[PDB]
Amino acid sequence: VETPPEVVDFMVSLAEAPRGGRVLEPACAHGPFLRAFREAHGTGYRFVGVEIDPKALDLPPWAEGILADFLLWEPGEAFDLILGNPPYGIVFKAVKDLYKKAFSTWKGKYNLYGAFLEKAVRLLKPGGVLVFVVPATWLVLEDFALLREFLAREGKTSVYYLGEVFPQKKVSAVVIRFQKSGKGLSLWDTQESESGFTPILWAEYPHWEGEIIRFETEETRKLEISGMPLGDLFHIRFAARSPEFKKHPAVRKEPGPGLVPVLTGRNLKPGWVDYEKNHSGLWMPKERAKELRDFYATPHLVVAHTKGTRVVAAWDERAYPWREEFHLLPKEGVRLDPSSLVQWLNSEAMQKHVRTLYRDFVPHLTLRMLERLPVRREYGFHT
Numbered sequence: 087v088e089t090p091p092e093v094v095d096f097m098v099s100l101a102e103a104p105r106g107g108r109v110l111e112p113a114c115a116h117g118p119f120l121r122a123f124r125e126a127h128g129t130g131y132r133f134v135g136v137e138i139d140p141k142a143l144d145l146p147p148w149a150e151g152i153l154a155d156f157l158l159w160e161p162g163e164a165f166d167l168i169l170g171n172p173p174y175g176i177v178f179k180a181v182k183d184l185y186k187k188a189f190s191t192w193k194g195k196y197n198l199y200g201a202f203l204e205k206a207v208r209l210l211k212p213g214g215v216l217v218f219v220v221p222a223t224w225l226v227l228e229d230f231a232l233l234r235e236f237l238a239r240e241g242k243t244s245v246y247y248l249g250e251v252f253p254q255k256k257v258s259a260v261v262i263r264f265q266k267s268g269k270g271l272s273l274w275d276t277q278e279s280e281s282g283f284t285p286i287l288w289a290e291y292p293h294w295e296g297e298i299i300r301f302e303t304e305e306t307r308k309l310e311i312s313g314m315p316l317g318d319l320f321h322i323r324f325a326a327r328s329p330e331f332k333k334h335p336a337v338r339k340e341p342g343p344g345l346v347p348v349l350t351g352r353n354l355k356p357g358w359v360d361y362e363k364n365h366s367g368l369w370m371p372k373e374r375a376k377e378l379r380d381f382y383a384t385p386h387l388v389v390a391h392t393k394g395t396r397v398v399a400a401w402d403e404r405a406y407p408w409r410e411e412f413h414l415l416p417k418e419g420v421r422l423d424p425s426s427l428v429q430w431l432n433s434e435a436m437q438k439h440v441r442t443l444y445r446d447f448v449p450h451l452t453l454r455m456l457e458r459l460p461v462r463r464e465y466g467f468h469t
């Protein structure tokens with residue numbers, strides 16, 4: 087992770103503060119952003135840094151270092167600019183309750199970076215600016231819904247997609263520039279070069295109010311317009327998990343005649359299901375799978391969520407028991423042609439659609455992404 091030089095250079099170039107203003111860097115350690123800003127915008131500012139570990143707090147004489155928990159810190163002042171790279175993650179857990187209590191945007195397991203964002207927006211004076219480098223997950227995940235509403239409600243938000251720029255991959259980063267005055271959302275793309283990053287305005291949402299953020303285009307919109315949402319034709323169910331199966335008196339750890347393998351994502355292929363190979367080590371009489379989840383008795387559509395931001399669909403003609411993935415059951419009055427549907431879902435046009443929109447924000451297809459995939463007119467419809 088850390089914060090690459092070019093990224094830091096990028097964030098400081100979006101940073102702005104009135105001469106004499108207070109500049110703050112949460113979880114600063116040695117103050118990388120504080121130093122970079124000074125070396126770029128000058129010295130006529132009041133510098134402050136908040137760090138929780140005495141062994142990490144190492145700031146220059148011109149900066150006021152404060153040893154505290156940013157989340158629990160309550161200064162008697164507001165700031166003009168807040169720069170930083172907040173902690174990414176979860177988790178003497180009286181502190182956890184303390185966080186929940188103090189943070190309104192807190193939902194589910196959440197993530198500390200979300201808490202740092204809310205706190206930061208609150209220590210901001212009117213017109214104040216905040217610049218943070220965080221994961222892209224808050225763009226589409228349901229746990230960040232309250233946060234997106236919070237930001238939309240509080241001011242103007244600019245999101246700059248950076249992608250996987252940290253040493254450790256599988257963490258797509260995004261720079262968020264927030265100003266506590268106004269409203270709207272501007273989505274920006276960036277081009278990496280020998281010189282660093284170059285911003286490219288993608289699209290603006292003046293009436294943004296917390297809705298999921300996606301990279302839309304003309305093709306994206308046409309496809310979604312000329313088709314019905316998958317979430318309108320199907321009931322998206324989830325499979326039972328191992329404990330449940332390991333708790334069923336009929337489930338065996340070894341094969342046998344009459345015993346059927348509990349399928350997993352490695353059995354689901356693009357367009358077909360490999361009913362043979364066992365990947366769970368659990369076997370059970372097919373007939374009794376209905377006792378875990380009713381839909382297990384019905385041949386239906388299976389879409390993967392363990393294969394990244396990719397749509398992999400297959401029709402479970404035999405109706406075998408599954409340990410995971412998305413399970414789609416048709417709604418009452420919906421008639422459809424399974425073969426054409428599957429072909430459609432696994433198509434190159436569908437992959438591009440999903441990839442254009444959600445890039446690598448998350449390492450998998452979510453319900454929300456799933457339920458709004460467009461099904462073509464002549465496959466499935468309502469009677």
Ligand SMILES: Nc1ncnc2c1ncn2[C@@H]1O[C@H](C[C@@H](N)CC[C@H](N)C(=O)O)[C@@H](O)[C@H]1O
Nearest residue numbers: 113115137138139142154155156171172173174
């Ligand atoms: N609650 C907190 N309050 C203040 N500083 C914190 C807090 N939690 C962690 N830090 C400090 O912030 C520094 C690290 C972060 N700035 C790094 C962010 C990086 N993106 C990460 O995921 O780790 C460390 O020196 C921590 O001691």
